Amino acid sequence: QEALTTQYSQSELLKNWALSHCLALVYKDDVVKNDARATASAYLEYGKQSVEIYHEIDEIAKKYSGLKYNGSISSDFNTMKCIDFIHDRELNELIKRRVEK
Amino acid sequence: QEALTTQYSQSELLKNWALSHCLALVYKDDVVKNDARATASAYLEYGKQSVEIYHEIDEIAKKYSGLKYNGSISSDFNTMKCIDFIHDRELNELIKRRVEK
Amino acid sequence: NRPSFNEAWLAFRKVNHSVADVGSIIGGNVGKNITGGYFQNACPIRMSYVLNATGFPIARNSPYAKVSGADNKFYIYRVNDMIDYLTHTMGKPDLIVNNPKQSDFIGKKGIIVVKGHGWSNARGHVTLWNGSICSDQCHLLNNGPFVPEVGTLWILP
Amino acid sequence: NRPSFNEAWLAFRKVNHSVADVGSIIGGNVGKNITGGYFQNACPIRMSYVLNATGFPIARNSPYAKVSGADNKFYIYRVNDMIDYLTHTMGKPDLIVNNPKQSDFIGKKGIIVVKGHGWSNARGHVTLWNGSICSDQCHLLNNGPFVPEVGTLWILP
């Protein structure tokens, strides 16, 4: 089955990249990290933006990936860091501002 | 640091649940799966919906989690299945239709 | 009235295990949802078990989300719902403490609710308290990252 | 004109390794982006290396996204961009084949592009072909899930 990768708009690709990249940062397991990295690379392929926009998305991702989240159940809540990240106002403004539409 | 969990609207919680649940399905590693499950449970806590809406979100998630994705690089693209899933029209209509606002 | 402290404490112990084990113990829809991974916070399910076991069962038509066990009794699965359920069924609280510490509850026993900030999955916790320790102290992960704002005790006789 | 087949094939081998290893070999911004995980598809980077190594370097101001190596030469990192780059620099293709099979390219050698459906990370692939096999055949995972629609060959002398 071919994935939906070619159907995403430029802004949607960048948001998809942001999410998969963040997941690649937060998870320890090599198979999961490599999968998230491979997935992010698919969204980069179809982008029309220079590499520095992804470097800047990473700068914002690191503000979330380095957080310590706690709860009344046992977990680091790594997945949650990336879900909070993809709602970040700075991230969404960065994407909307972009020079390369 | 407390996460942003309490700031999400009911529809946003359900979409957050959908994403974290799907990630819990697709990844093999126990630490990652448990993390995604714990994260999903946080969004369920704050929902006002009955459990069957999450069961139905799962029914849709399974249409994506069972896909086989291929590429010109080595990966199962598991992360991608869940990113495609969260754009699914049926999922977004299910959430918008919901009886419990 | 209210569950006896002794019966409540005994019943809590039966489910003072991992959420997976709680699912096995209770079975039915509780078990199915735990096996499926939908429920991970056993807190309100253990409190539901206490109420069901001590002769104060959660009514089918209580205005809170709940699922049945193999016993055909009902189990609330949200912390916020369990807190609200107790507020509406337990009568007047016996102690309410702003910015609570464990020392504030010494010498009295029953059902304790703490609401506060710092947890990413809940606004608080509900458990039993015997005057010295909580019934799930063994799971109580943490001066932790949770900052208690209000603590409420309903004494059990 | 065009890179000699022999020099292109030799140069390709130097980078016919894992993307991590390609990053180590090329260094500079190529390496930094590979270490950071931003690039995972080595396909266009290997083709860039071939062009840079055989005396047909990618111009700094070519209208395609690229990053520099430790050699201060430039490396295109998108498959679609590498395909378009070749279309605009290589002259007329020597063979264009609808619904191509490997057998259609027997007996001729040079740079091959295949576009098709079935891959989730790209619309196609660009590599070298020696009349019998691709230069990265050893990595060519798969009648696979990729269905070739169009194959194009520029002969290298």
Tell me which chain A residues have a C-beta less than 8 angstroms from the C-beta of B13.
Answer: none
Tell me which chain D residues have a C-beta less than 8 angstroms from the C-beta of B69.
Answer: 120
CB burial of C16-43 (b: ≥16 within 10 Å; e: otherwise) equals bbebeebbebbebbbbbbbeebbbbbbb
Residue with tokens 């459990």: B51
Strand D74-76 and strand D124-129: the pairing is unpaired
Q: What is the resolution of this structure in A?
A: 1.8
> Are residues A75 and B38, on separate chains, in Cβ contact within 8 Å?
yes
Residue D69 to residue B17: CA distance in whole angstroms: 43
Tell me which chain A residues have a C-beta less than 8 angstroms from the C-beta of B87.
Answer: 4, 12
Residue D62 to residue D131: CA distance in whole angstroms: 30
The values of phi and psi at residue D107, to 5°, are 90, -5
On whether the CB atoms of residues C77 and C92 are closer than 8 A, the answer is no
On whether the CB atoms of residues C81 and C67 are closer than 8 A, the answer is no
Alpha helices in C15-153 (DSSP H): 19-26, 28-35, 43-53, 79-89
Alpha helices in C15-124 (DSSP H): 19-26, 28-35, 43-53, 79-89
Residues in B lying within 8 Å of C, measured between beta carbons: 2-3, 5-6, 21, 24, 37-38, 40-42, 44-46, 49-51, 54-55, 58
Residue C34 to residue C27: CA distance in whole angstroms: 9
CATH number for the domain that contains residue D20:
3.90.1720.70
> What are the residues whose beta carbons fall under 8 Å from the beta carbon of B89, sequence distance 6 or more?
none
Strand D66-68 and strand C124-129: the pairing is unpaired
Q: What share of chain C is helix, strand, coil (3-state, %, to 5)?
A: 35, 20, 45
> What are the residues whose beta carbons fall under 8 Å from the beta carbon of C53, sequence distance 6 or more?
C7, C11, C14
Residue A90 to residue A72: CA distance in whole angstroms: 30
Tell me which chain C residues have a C-beta less than 8 angstroms from the C-beta of A69.
Answer: 120
Total of domains in chain C: 1
Q: How many CA atoms lie within 13 A of D149 on its CB side?
A: 7
Per domain, the residue ranges of chain A are 1-101
A49 touches chain B (CB under 8 A): no
Residue with tokens 């809940």: C122
Residue C125 to residue A70: CA distance in whole angstroms: 14
How far is B77 from chain C, CA to nearest CA, in Å? 23
The values of phi and psi at residue B99, to 5°, are -70, -40
The answer, yes or no, to whether B and A have at least 3 beta-carbon pairs within 8 Å is: yes
On whether the CB atoms of residues B47 and B13 are closer than 8 A, the answer is yes
Backbone angle region of C118, left / alpha / beta, with phi > 0 → left and psi within -120 to 50 → alpha: left
Structure tokens at D113: 């592009």
On whether the CB atoms of residues C7 and C157 are closer than 8 A, the answer is no
> Are residues D117 and A2, on separate chains, in Cβ contact within 8 Å?
yes
Residue A87 to residue A63: CA distance in whole angstroms: 13
DSSP A20: H
- Architecture label for domain B1-101: Up-down Bundle (1.20)
> Are residues A71 and B35, on separate chains, in Cβ contact within 8 Å?
no
Handedness of CA B19, B23, B24, B25 (dihedral sign): positive
Boundaries of domain holding D20: 1-157
Residue B28 to residue B30: CA distance in whole angstroms: 6
How far is D151 from chain B, CA to nearest CA, in Å? 16
The values of phi and psi at residue D111, to 5°, are -95, 125
The values of phi and psi at residue C134, to 5°, are -85, 155
The answer, yes or no, to whether A and D have at least 3 beta-carbon pairs within 8 Å is: yes
Provide the experimental method for this PDB entry.
X-ray
On whether the CB atoms of residues C62 and C22 are closer than 8 A, the answer is no
On whether the CB atoms of residues D45 and D26 are closer than 8 A, the answer is yes
Query: DSSP labels for chain D?
Result: ----HHHHHHHHHHT-S-HHHHHHHH-HHHHHHHHTTS----HHHHHHHHHHHTT-PPPTTSSS-EEE-TTS-EEE--HHHHHHHHHHHS-S-SEEEES--GGGGTT--EEEEEEEES-SS-SEEEEEE-SSSBTTTTT-----S-EEEEEEEEE--
Residue C130 to residue A42: CA distance in whole angstroms: 57
